[PDB]
Amino acid sequence: MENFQKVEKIGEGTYGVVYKARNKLTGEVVALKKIRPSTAIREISLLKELNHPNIVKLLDVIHTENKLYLVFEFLHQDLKKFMDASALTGIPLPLIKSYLFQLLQGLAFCHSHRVLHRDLKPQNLLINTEGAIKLADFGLARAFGVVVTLWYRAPEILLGCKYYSTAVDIWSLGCIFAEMVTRRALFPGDSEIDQLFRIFRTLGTPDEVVWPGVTSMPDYKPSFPKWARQDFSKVVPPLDEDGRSLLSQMLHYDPNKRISAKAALAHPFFQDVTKPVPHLRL
Numbered sequence: 001m002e003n004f005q006k007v008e009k010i011g012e013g014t015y016g017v018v019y020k021a022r023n024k025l026t027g028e029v030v031a032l033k034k035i036r037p038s039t040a041i042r043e044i045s046l047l048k049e050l051n052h053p054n055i056v057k058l059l060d061v062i063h064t065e066n067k068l069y070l071v072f073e074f075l076h077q078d079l080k081k082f083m084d085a086s087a088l089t090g091i092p093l094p095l096i097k098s099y100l101f102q103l104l105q106g107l108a109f110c111h112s113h114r115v116l117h118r119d120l121k122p123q124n125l126l127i128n129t130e131g132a133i134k135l136a137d138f139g140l141a142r143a144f145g146v147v148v149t150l151w152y153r154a155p156e157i158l159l160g161c162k163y164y165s166t167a168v169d170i171w172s173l174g175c176i177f178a179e180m181v182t183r184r185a186l187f188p189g190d191s192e193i194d195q196l197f198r199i200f201r202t203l204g205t206p207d208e209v210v211w212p213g214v215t216s217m218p219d220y221k222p223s224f225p226k227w228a229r230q231d232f233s234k235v236v237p238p239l240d241e242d243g244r245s246l247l248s249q250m251l252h253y254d255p256n257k258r259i260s261a262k263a264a265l266a267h268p269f270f271q272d273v274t275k276p277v278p279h280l281r282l
């Protein structure tokens with residue numbers, strides 16, 4: 001890229017290396033991701049039309065010299081770093097609520113346009129000095145697909161379901177909501193089965209009563225141990241009942257019972273939502 005002036009490599013992103021770069025002409029500072037099919041090109045291109053304040057803007061999709069580059073609006077920090085930086089004192093509840101509320105607005109928008117994320121995690125939630133938080137990498141999993149963190153994966157994906165639904169994003173966001181609250185990942189699995197069993201150990205091994213059709217899932221085994229469900233009061237203390245109620249609805253096993261982003265925005269937990277300024281050290 002002669003048009004760009006690589007300011008520095010900022011990591012080995014999900015689909016390849018990413019650099020902070022400055023457009024030599026416009027002078028704009030952007031994030032440039034070089035990706036490792038005409039089908040993908042078209043899908044990816046469609047995402048350039050997906051604009052919302054809580055979605056990281058995809059500025060350009062460049063297919064040149066038979067290589068793929070994605071140009072994104074730049075944000076200085078991700079939620080994973082912010083959480084680590086806030087680990088001693090914890091992110092204040094008003095800011096956790098503001099962030100959750102904005103992320104749900106972003107999801108509601110994407111989902112209303114039939115676009116799924118599929119791989120939400122703290123690392124792809126970007127924040128700025130003005131108190132905004134934005135979802136990065138929306139739609140890339142589908143446009144592409146085919147050590148990976150499993151911590152935020154919905155149980156239907158772990159059980160081998162081949163058709164994802166918007167519910168997988170709500171599950172991931174519930175896991176992130178819990179992590180901001182407790183300052184510890186909710187389900188830190190280190191293998192697909194450890195991930196699944198960590199979920200079962202906390203929410204109870206699912207059965208046909210709470211999840212109709214679960215025993216017919218591709219990777220379900222009658223041999224799975226049967227764990228009893230624990231109480232949310234023990235899961236995300238000291239979160240209040242409004243928060244626990246919303247989290248419980250975001251973590252329902254049955255994707256069809258899982259709350260939608262639109263419905264979650266109307267949950268009583270957000271009655272007093274505000275938009276605080278975070279303490280950001282850049």
Ligand SMILES: NC(=O)c1cc([N+](=O)[O-])ccc1NCc1ccc(C(=O)O)cc1
Nearest residue numbers: 010013018031033072073074075076077
């Ligand atoms: N749009 C983007 O600004 C961005 C993009 C990616 N990415 O993998 O495509 C990954 C992280 C991003 N920002 C947050 C960020 C910025 C700088 C640094 C750093 O300098 O270490 C780390 C994270």
